[PDB]
Amino acid sequence: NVTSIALRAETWLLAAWHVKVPPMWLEACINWIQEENNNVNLSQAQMNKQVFEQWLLTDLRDLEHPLLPDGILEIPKGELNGFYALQINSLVDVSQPAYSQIQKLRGKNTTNDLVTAEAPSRMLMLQLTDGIVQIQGMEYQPIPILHSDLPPGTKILIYGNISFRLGVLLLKPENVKVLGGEVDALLEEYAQEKVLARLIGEPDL
Amino acid sequence: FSRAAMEMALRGVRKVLCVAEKNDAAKGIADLLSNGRMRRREGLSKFNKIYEFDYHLYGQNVTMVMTSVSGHLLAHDFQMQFRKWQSCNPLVLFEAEIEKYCPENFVDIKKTLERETRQCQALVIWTDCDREGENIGFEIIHVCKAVKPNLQVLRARFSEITPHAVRTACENLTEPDQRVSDAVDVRQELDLRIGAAFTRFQTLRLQRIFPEVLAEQLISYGSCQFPTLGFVVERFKAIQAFVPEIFHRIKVTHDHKDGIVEFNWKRHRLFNHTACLVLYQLCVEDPMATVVEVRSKPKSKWRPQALDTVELEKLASRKLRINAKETMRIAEKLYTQGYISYPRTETNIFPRDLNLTVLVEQQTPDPRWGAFAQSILERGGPTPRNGNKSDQAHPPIHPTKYTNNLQGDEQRLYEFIVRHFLACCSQDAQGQETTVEIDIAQERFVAHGLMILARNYLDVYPYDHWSDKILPVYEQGSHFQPSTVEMVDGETSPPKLLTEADLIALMEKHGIGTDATHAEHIETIKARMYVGLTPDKRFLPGHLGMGLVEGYDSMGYEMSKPDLRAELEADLKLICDGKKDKFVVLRQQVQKYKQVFIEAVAKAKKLDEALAQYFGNGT
Ligand SMILES: [Mg+2]
Numbered sequence: 001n002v003t004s005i006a007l008r009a010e011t012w013l014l015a016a017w018h019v020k021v022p023p024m025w026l027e028a029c030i031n032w033i034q035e036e037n038n039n040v041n042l043s044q045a046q047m048n049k050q051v052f053e054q055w056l057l058t059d060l061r062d063l064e065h066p067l068l069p070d071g072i073l074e075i076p077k078g079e080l081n082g083f084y085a086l087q088i089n090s091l092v093d094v095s096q097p098a099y100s101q102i103q104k105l106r107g108k109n110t111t112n113d114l115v116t117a118e119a120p121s122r123m124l125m126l127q128l129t130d131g132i133v134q135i136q137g138m139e140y141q142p143i144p145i146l147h148s149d150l151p152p153g154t155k156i157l158i159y160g161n162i163s164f165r166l167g168v169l170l171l172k173p174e175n176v177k178v179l180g181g182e183v184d185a186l187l188e189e190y191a192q193e194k195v196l197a198r199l200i201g202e203p204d205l
Numbered sequence: 206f207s208r209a210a211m212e213m214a215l216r217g218v219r220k221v222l223c224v225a226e227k228n229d230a231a232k233g234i235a236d237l238l239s240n241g242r243m244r245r246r247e248g249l250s251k252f253n254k255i256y257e258f259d260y261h262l263y264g265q266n267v268t269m270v271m272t273s274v275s276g277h278l279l280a281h282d283f284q285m286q287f288r289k290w291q292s293c294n295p296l297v298l299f300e301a302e303i304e305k306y307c308p309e310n311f312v313d314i315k316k317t318l319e320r321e322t323r324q325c326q327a328l329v330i331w332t333d334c335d336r337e338g339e340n341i342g343f344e345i346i347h348v349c350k351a352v353k354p355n356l357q358v359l360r361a362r363f364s365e366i367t368p369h370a371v372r373t374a375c376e377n378l379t380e381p382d383q384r385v386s387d388a389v390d391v392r393q394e395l396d397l398r399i400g401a402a403f404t405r406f407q408t409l410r411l412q413r414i415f416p417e418v419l420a421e422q423l424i425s426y427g428s429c430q431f432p433t434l435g436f437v438v439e440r441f442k443a444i445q446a447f448v449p450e451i452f453h454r455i456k457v458t459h460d461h462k463d464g465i466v467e468f469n470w471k472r473h474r475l476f477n478h479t480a481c482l483v484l485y486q487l488c489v490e491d492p493m494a495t496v497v498e499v500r501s502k503p504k505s506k507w508r509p510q511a512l513d514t515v516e517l518e519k520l521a522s523r524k525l526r527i528n529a530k531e532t533m534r535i536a537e538k539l540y541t542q543g544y545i546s547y548p549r550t551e552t553n554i555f556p557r558d559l560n561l562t563v564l565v566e567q568q569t570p571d572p573r574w575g576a577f578a579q580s581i582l583e584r585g586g587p588t589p590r591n592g593n594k595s596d597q598a599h600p601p602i603h604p605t606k607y608t609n610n611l612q613g614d615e616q617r618l619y620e621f622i623v624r625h626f627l628a629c630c631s632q633d634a635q636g637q638e639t640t641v642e643i644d645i646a647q648e649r650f651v652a653h654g655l656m657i658l659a660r661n662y663l664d665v666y667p668y669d670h671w672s673d674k675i676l677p678v679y680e681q682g683s684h685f686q687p688s689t690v691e692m693v694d695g696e697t698s699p700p701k702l703l704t705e706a707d708l709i710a711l712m713e714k715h716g717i718g719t720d721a722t723h724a725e726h727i728e729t730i731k732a733r734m735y736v737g738l739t740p741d742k743r744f745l746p747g748h749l750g751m752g753l754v755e756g757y758d759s760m761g762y763e764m765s766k767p768d769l770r771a772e773l774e775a776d777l778k779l780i781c782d783g784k785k786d787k788f789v790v791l792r793q794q795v796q797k798y799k800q801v802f803i804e805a806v807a808k809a810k811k812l813d814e815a816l817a818q819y820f821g822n823g824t
Binding site: 112116 | 436439440447449450452471472473474475476477479480482483487519522523697700704709710711714
């Protein structure tokens with residue numbers, strides 16, 4: 001019986017990070033943290049931190065806890081209000097060619113390729129999920145906290161008033177907060193090299 | 206060294222033997238020093254005449270016996286024993302004894318120099334003032350010193366064949382530079398050893414592997430021609446590998462009485478249809494454009510920088526469509542005839558000694574550029590745009606004398622050199638740049654404008670283009686309806702195949718082809734059929750050219766890279782400055798290339814495998 005600690009952790013998770021978790025995951029999680037730190041009787045402050053760290057490493061797809069409202073993909077245009085602690089599955093810069101990007105990433109030198117005798121703000125396109133519905137997040141205004149090297153499974157808070165169109169959220173810096181974390185299962189498949197290689201038609205992916 | 210030292214040295218000199226690089230240089234220099242009073246005489250070579258004339262050298266009245274050679278008097282090769290391909294293993298050519306000899310066709314010239322040395326008390330070298338010219342000078346010294354070992358040897362230094370230059374050369378004779386001659390002997394030796402060893406190795410091997418394809422064909426190797434080919438194959442491969450991508454952009458245009466204004470998206474373009482579609486949909490609903498910022502600042506177009514060999518070779522190809530080999534041939538002809546300064550120089554700084562005001566004045570009789578030349582003089586005088594390089598030997602290539610008697614390409618290159626010189630000595634074009642930023646549904650678009658106020662150097666230099674792009678009047682705060690709001694598609698474009706000027710640029714960047722030798726190496730890969738010119742006219746590699754580069758590059762060591770030749774050429778510059786001796790450079794370069802050779806012989810089957818991709822099976 002860890003249901004007393006679960007309510008206190010649930011209160012804190014929502015209050016501090018607007019993180020919503022199912023009761024069964026939360027109870028299973030507390031029990032594991034108690035087994036891991038068997039020798040001690042942890043404080044609620046330490047428990048809340050360790051629960052949140054486990055959440056940051058959890059695949060929301062495996063959590064089965066809807067956050068984003070129903071039929072958000074069914075509406076052609078609208079506005080979204082409220083706090084959502086979602087997960088980035090994959091991320092790419094659409095302001096730059098993927099071939100140009102993969103070349104730089106692969107560290108190969110293409111200096112002689114742009115030699116001739118004759119004398120652009122970034123836009124990241126985020127693949128966001130609550131674990132049930134998958135939508136897109138666009139860098140409408142420069143959001144410097146986001147970068148292409150963020151690990152797949154990175155948890156981010158999407159809040160405030162956000163205008164959406166054709167399954168794309170028009171995110172401004174005042175609407176984004178990076179929580180951290182990663183998903184091992186996603187690190188493999190949606191690594192920046194693999195994301196870009198797919199956009200230039202490279203096989204075995 | 207001093208005037209008293211020279212006068213003392215000259216005492217008792219009656220006949221002075223003078224030797225030029227070619228007969229036309231000898232006829233020209235003799236005509237100017239003698240004031241046409243020279244007396245022609247015949248040498249043992251029908252094409253290399255003797256021009257006798259009385260002259261006064263360092264307070265001594267002498268008879269100047271002005272003759273010439275026909276370029277390099279001596280040929281370098283291995284001994285007879287190693288000369289036959291089947292007489293030795295190509296690897297021994299890295300140590301095989303090398304000798305200098307006079308070819309049968311030049312023996313008449315060698316015998317004329319020897320003949321005249323007997324009647325002459327001093328020798329003055331009048332070969333062109335470059336590395337090859339100093340080496341030719343030392344070939345003339347060796348031949349004459351064989352007759353008279355105590356012969357007084359002097360060197361005339363000049364950058365043009367004009368009465369003042371050749372007269373000053375006589376008042377400022379110097380000692381012949383053995384250091385620059387030695388750097389030529391080192392390059393000549395390395396080119397023979399690396400050239401012979403690698404050529405014999407691949408030609409004999411590939412003739413055995415592909416008999417039907419490469420029968421009696423010569424697969425040559427050059428330490429510089431190989432990285433030159435490498436650039437052409439590297440660019441072709443870049444294009445072959447390039448993946449084009451579809452992009453989308455919002456195009457907003459606004460129609461005006463005498464022209465459509467196109468506002469360019471500040472986001473430029475997006476490689477995602479949904480990302481652009483969403484932003485475009487926002488623009489169709491509320492397309493009312495508001496003038497955010499109407500900014501304007503002075504813009505200027507810079508006049509050309511003082512001309513050096515590389516810029517001449519590149520601009521003659523791009524602007525005049527004359528290839529570097531021809532440009533250098535015409536440029537040498539105009540130099541010899543006295544119309545331009547020595548066209549083999551790295552200098553882009555006009556020396557303080559040089560009177561630019563006279564050189565400009567000299568061009569005022571011309572119907573086309575005469576008025577402009579006068580204009581420079583009226584506006585205070587010449588104000589050249591100098592660079593940062595100086596060889597400390599020659600000034601930038603410039604017109605030394607006015608002529609209107611030139612024809613064909615000779616006229617085209619002279620006209621180019623004159624216009625560039627005047628443009629350089631002129632002012633920069635001055636204009637006014639304007640920009641109008643508009644907002645459509647929080648999306649920013651920008652239209653640009655240009656208004657040239659003073660064309661300046663552009664009035665003499667038509668090879669550069671600047672054009673007015675006059676924008677209509679937009680007030681900061683205005684609101685308007687755009688003509689069209691579109692969502693157009695584009696694609697990324699690959700690089701293009703290299704042009705000659707593009708190839709020279711890459712060679713320059715990587716430090717190969719130095720001492721104005723770019724053309725020679727580009728011509729060799731053209732002639733050996735390793736590269737071919739497209740109708741565009743860009744460099745396309747052939748199957749043998751392609752196969753050799755990817756054959757050696759598959760061996761591990763990146764041989765198509767120009768790093769090893771750049772190091773070789775760097776060492777040659779050190780020999781000239783006396784910063785390194787010729788024996789260490791030779792030992793080091795030979796050890797370096799012998800190693801690369803030994804690794805290539807070990808992995809020789811890689812060459813067969815790379816070419817098999819094109820010629821198929823073969824044993
Ligand atoms: Mg020469």
